[PDB]
Write an enzyme that holds these catalytic residues in place. Structure first.
Site, PDB file in Angstrom:
ATOM      1  N   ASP A  35      62.119  30.902  39.906  1.00  0.00           N
ATOM      2  CA  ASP A  35      60.962  31.649  39.375  1.00  0.00           C
ATOM      3  C   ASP A  35      61.327  32.569  38.276  1.00  0.00           C
ATOM      4  O   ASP A  35      61.828  33.768  38.592  1.00  0.00           O
ATOM      5  CB  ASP A  35      60.275  32.279  40.491  1.00  0.00           C
ATOM      6  N   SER A 199      53.853  33.672  20.968  1.00  0.00           N
ATOM      7  CA  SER A 199      53.803  32.304  20.549  1.00  0.00           C
ATOM      8  C   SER A 199      52.963  32.615  19.205  1.00  0.00           C
ATOM      9  O   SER A 199      52.450  33.637  18.942  1.00  0.00           O
ATOM     10  CB  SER A 199      52.758  31.480  21.472  1.00  0.00           C
TER      11      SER A 199
END
EC number: 3.4.23.22
Length: 330
Positions: A35, A199
């Site tokens: 994770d 992004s």
């Protein structure tokens, strides 16, 4: 040193991925959920409340000659999905794919929430976010990667998750045969303890690319792709009959649909998520309403590039003094 381990979807939907981890001496192999959105290595154990164990493999520290109680240390974590666990702490030898760390904090669960109990395939979590998020008190502990880093050939790990197939976590090296083209690297902020990046935009299907900054985290422990409501609405608007259902808890779509791809930007590069990756199947057994793999982050407080996004790429988690993230197509 290096390590290389295969990671395997827990079910036919890729709801999560499990990777075998050797703990203790002799080795006890547990299948952990790696994770990159948390920083605790915790396991079902011989100390876990019996009624809360249902099929998991447990770590029994009393059977490990290298286990030592970390005196006074406790831990307690709550995840973004509302699940939680807590307990005490041992140090022990932990190996992943041939890479061994001695003195790793292994957090033994005394309690786990129902979500964990109900998932027989996940024996615990191995956190790969920054150690500043580790919950051990009163002495915060380091992640497996942090402990291994100085020994690694290169201070990196990579995630290469499969679509409906196994994939690979590598430590200490970049497998140049595992991706196509070049890896595009992008800046990381560690201020919130995550692999947080920005992004450069998105496209829906064959649509034009929208240049827009989307701050979010690269999180292998989250199943879906959570993005701003504007972006998510634009995606689902291209699927006939798709709608946001408050009763189901997100966007659903007719199972008869053909889903468009979703592209996200990494600098000037582009990662394409095929439409099929965005299908999470019937909302309930036999239903013709299917759950979407792209969902709104509104009310999460952060955008999350979870498995839906990451499995479309070869992803480099670069833990150099100034960390960065790399993405390549594959």
């Amino acid at each position: 040193s290096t390590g290389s381990a295969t990671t395997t979807p827990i079910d036919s939907l890729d709801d999560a991925y499990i990777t075998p981890v050797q703990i203790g001496t002799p080795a006890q192999t547990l299948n952990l959920d790696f994770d990159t959105g948390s920083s605790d290595l915790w396991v079902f154990s011989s100390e876990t409340t019996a009624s809360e164990v249902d099929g998991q493999t447990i770590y029994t520290p009393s059977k490990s000659t290298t286990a030592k109680l970390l005196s006074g240390a406790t831990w307690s974590i709550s995840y973004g999905d509302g699940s939680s666990s807590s307990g005490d702490v041992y140090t022990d030898t932990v190996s992943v794919g041939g890479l061994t760390v001695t003195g790793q904090a292994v957090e033994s669960a005394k309690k786990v929430s129902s979500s964990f109990t109900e998932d027989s395939t996940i024996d615990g979590l191995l956190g790969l976010a920054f150690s500043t998020l580790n919950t051990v008190s009163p002495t915060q502990q380091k992640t497996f990667f942090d402990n291994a880093k100085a020994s690694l050939d290169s201070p990196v790990f990579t995630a290469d998750l499969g679509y409906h197939a196994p994939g690979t976590y590598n430590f200490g090296f970049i497998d140049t045969t595992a991706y196509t083209g070049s890896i595009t690297y992008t800046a990381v902020s560690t201020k919130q303890g995550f692999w947080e990046w920005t992004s450069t935009g998105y496209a829906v299907g064959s649509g034009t690319f929208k240049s827009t900054s989307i701050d979010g985290i690269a999180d292998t422990g989250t199943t879906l792709l959570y993005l701003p409501a504007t972006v998510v609405s634009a995606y689902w608007a291209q699927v006939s009959g798709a709608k946001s259902s408050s009763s189901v808890g997100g966007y659903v779509f007719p199972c008869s649909a053909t889903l468009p791809s979703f592209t996200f930007g990494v600098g000037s590069a582009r990662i394409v998520i095929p439409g099929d990756y965005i299908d999470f199947g019937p909302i309930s057994t036999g239903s013709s309403s299917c759950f979407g793999g792209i969902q709104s982050s509104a009310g999460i407080g952060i955008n999350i590039f979870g498995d839906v996004a990451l499995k479309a790429a070869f992803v480099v988690f670069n833990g150099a003094t100034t960390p960065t993230l790399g993405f390549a197509s594959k």
